Design a binder for this molecule. Structure first.
Ligand SMILES: [Zn+2]
Lengths: 155, 183, 43, 101
RNA sequence: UGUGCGAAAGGGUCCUGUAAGCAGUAGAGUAGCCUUGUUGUUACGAUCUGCUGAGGGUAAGCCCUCCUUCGCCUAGAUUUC
RNA sequence: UUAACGAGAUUCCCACUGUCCCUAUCUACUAUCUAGCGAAACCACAGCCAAGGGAACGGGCUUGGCAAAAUCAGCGGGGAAA
RNA sequence: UAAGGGAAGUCGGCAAAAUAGAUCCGUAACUUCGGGAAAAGGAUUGGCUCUAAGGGUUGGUAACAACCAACUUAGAACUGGUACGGACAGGGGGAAUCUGACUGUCUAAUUAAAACAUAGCAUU
RNA sequence: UGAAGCCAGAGGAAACUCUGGUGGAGGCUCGCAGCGGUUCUGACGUGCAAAUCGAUCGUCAAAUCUGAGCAUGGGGGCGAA
């Protein structure tokens, strides 16, 4: 008894690969009598032909390793293989920092904490790499405000 | 001749056994085997390797304080030879060996006292969690015992107990699979 | 179990033999004749 | 990483032992003998920067203070704190002793 | 038909290096609950300690075993002054 | 007395090592044995030597040494083989 | 793979071994000032438990709280060790000479080169 | 690796100089594919193959690799020769 045609037809009917087709070994003559797709569908409905489930590929180890790397494990010099720039680019870091500083300056000018001339010179200082982060820019704005208030109180 | 001891592990070193390392500071290291010699060349600590007498002493698993351990020493002051002294020494060596053996066995039992209580507690916990896996009669066997007790006017619980005795005595293992009949 | 190479066929896809099921219940210690598995078993 | 790990256990690649390191730490004469065994002009940094714990020469004070933060130096410190294995400990392990009168 | 042969097993002798699991006022620290700290407590936590020279392997060209089990046996075929 | 560059050619140094002293051992696939399948190159005839055989050559001739069926694995002196 | 020795081997260190990822210290002559350069020579790298920095939205010196999200970087304690780029992957380096400027190209099937081309230059 | 251009700070009468960023140039460079074909007492040598197989090697953003259509024809063509 040859069942190659039946295996191919059952794969096409079940919508799977031929390695996922299960033909009942105790029903080989009745499966061999099935030459048409209607007969294969009838055997599938009878349960003589079933589609085997997929083989396991779990992501549990990947998720635990992701949580460990999030909390800081496996980040040492023995784990690093690419260069520092290949791992995190300085251009990406700079672009993020510039966008953060420009967003903060636009917010402060819109709210009215700083005026337009102060905004302009702070924009050019941020482009000239004076402030390394948002807290640095905020503290610079505060010290400039303190100097301006002291000058106004003196005058 | 004399019996030396391995520097690394402490086993008896007999003549032509092992290898000696001579260091430039003036110290010599006798090893009983290539295992100890290679671990020494790999700079492993004998105190951290659990198969060594050094580890066993540091862990307190050898009897270290005893009266019988005071009789063997490196005698650096020789004694003029005396036949009577040597024979009474040999008799002393036998008696010391026997006494040391019995005291060592007592020391080991004092190390291993609590095992019975720990095992009994573990067994009680296991039985309490798994009462349902204890041996049980078949339903067909229970029905046959019930009808036989009704016929003979006997105790069904009694018949159940000797049947549990029989199935406890007869241990049968189960095989996987089974032959498929040919057409 | 052979889960490295292939998945286990689900239990609902295999017809359970009446002799094996009756034997397993007899091992567990129940009366199969009192429940009548012959009527429940299909053909 | 270890340089040329295949022939690491040869006698011609042998390093100083921990008991000798303990003797060098407790007594300067032993360390002086070990240093007279070497030639100072061929040493890294002319022999001026030496770690007794690691029994090792370094090219600069920055390099020596640098290795002190590393884990090999800390493992040497831990092993010295535990104590090196010696002949008297080996003798006590079998309960043997020396009768000197 | 034996001081037999074979398969197991037990003992020995060697090799490795202390099994799984459970427990611990061992454990850097962190977070909750409350007595708001008095091992405060509970929880997680590499590792450490004990049970544990333990666990595993051992003839495949290691040894012993009428007296530890089970099996096999006086064939079959061919040829020969 | 020309920098950089080069699968260009040459000498040396450190490191390194079975290159060597001086060899040993292990694994796989062969070779080997079996079942099946199954060529070719080459082939005057053949194949043990020694001395002599004028033409600096003998395998066959002369004179000696000798000389016993049928075979298998290898080998690379001779014949064969580019 | 190999004790001890370490090129004594060989026409010739052929072949093999050694080096190698990343972080940090450091890097000479020469030079067409661009390079050389990853020159050379060094320190380190596991696991675990933490700490710190780097954002967005909402809420009335808010220069403050809450919530949300993900990956990098630095610092510290503890801990196993014969090994920590533990497999894999992955420069040996240096001092010189000759030679062609370089990138490139050809003798398909024995020669890849000081040959050819090239830009630059000169002549008709 | 980091050329022009650009930003900031410190000087300098200015022209310029120094420091830190940004930017992303190159018949630049390590190297995966592809393309090529250096080396090996390599494999193979009546081969898997009338030029193949392994390791190693050169190049890898361009004077790079490549399909189809079309052109050049033997006193010829084409030729980084
Ligand atoms: Zn020993």
């Amino acid at each position: 008894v040859n069942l190659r045609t039946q295996k191919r037809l059952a794969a096409s009917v079940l919508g799977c690969g031929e390695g996922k087709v299960w033909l009942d070994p105790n029903e080989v003559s009745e499966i061999s009598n099935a030459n048409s797709r209607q007969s294969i569908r009838k055997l599938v409905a009878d349960g003589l032909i079933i589609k085997k489930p997929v083989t396991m590929h779990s992501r549990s180890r990947a998720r635990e390793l992701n949580l460990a790397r999030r909390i800081g494990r496996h980040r040492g010099f023995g784990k690093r293989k690419g260069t520092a720039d290949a791992r995190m680019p300085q251009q990406v870091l700079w672009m993020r920092r510039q966008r953060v500083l420009r967003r903060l300056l636009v917010k402060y000018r819109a709210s009215g904490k700083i005026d337009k001339h102060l905004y302009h010179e702070l924009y050019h200082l941020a482009k000239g790499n004076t402030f390394k982060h948002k807290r640095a820019l905020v503290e610079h704005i505060h010290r400039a405000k303190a100097e301006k208030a002291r000058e106004r109180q003196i005058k | 001749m004399r019996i030396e001891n391995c520097f690394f592990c402490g086993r008896p070193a007999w003549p032509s056994k092992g290898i000696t390392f001579m260091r430039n500071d003036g110290k010599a290291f006798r090893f009983c085997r290539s295992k100890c010699h290679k671990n020494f060349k790999m700079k492993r600590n004998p105190r951290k390797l659990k198969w060594t007498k050094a580890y066993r002493k540091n862990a307190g698993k050898e009897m270290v304080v005893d009266s019988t351990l005071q009789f063997a020493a490196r005698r650096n002051v020789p004694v003029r030879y005396n036949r009577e002294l040597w024979q009474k020494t040999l008799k002393a060596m036998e008696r010391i060996s026997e006494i040391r053996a019995r005291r060592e066995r007592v020391f080991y039992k004092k190390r291993m006292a609590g095992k019975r209580a720990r095992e009994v507690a573990a067994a009680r916990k296991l039985v309490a969690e798994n009462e349902h896996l204890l041996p049980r009669l078949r339903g067909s066997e229970k029905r046959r015992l019930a009808e036989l007790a009704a016929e003979r006017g006997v105790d069904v619980e009694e018949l159940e107990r000797e049947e549990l005795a029989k199935l406890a005595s007869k241990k049968k293992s189960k095989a996987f699979g089974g032959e498929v009949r040919r057409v | 179990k052979s889960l490295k190479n292939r998945a286990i066929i689900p239990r609902k896809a295999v017809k359970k033999p009446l002799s094996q099921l009756e034997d397993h219940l007899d091992q567990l210690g129940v009366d199969t004749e009192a429940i009548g598995l012959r009527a429940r078993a299909q053909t | 990483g270890v340089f040329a790990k295949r022939t690491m256990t040869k006698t011609r690649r042998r390093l100083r032992d921990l008991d000798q390191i303990e003797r060098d730490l407790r007594s300067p004469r032993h360390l002086q003998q070990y240093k007279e065994t070497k030639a100072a002009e061929d040493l890294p940094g002319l022999g001026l920067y030496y770690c007794i714990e690691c029994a090792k020469w370094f090219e600069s004070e920055t390099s020596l203070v640098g290795h002190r933060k590393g884990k090999p130096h800390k493992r040497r410190l831990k092993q010295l704190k535990e104590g090196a294995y010696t002949h008297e400990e080996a003798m006590a392990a079998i309960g043997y002793r020396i009768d000197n009168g």
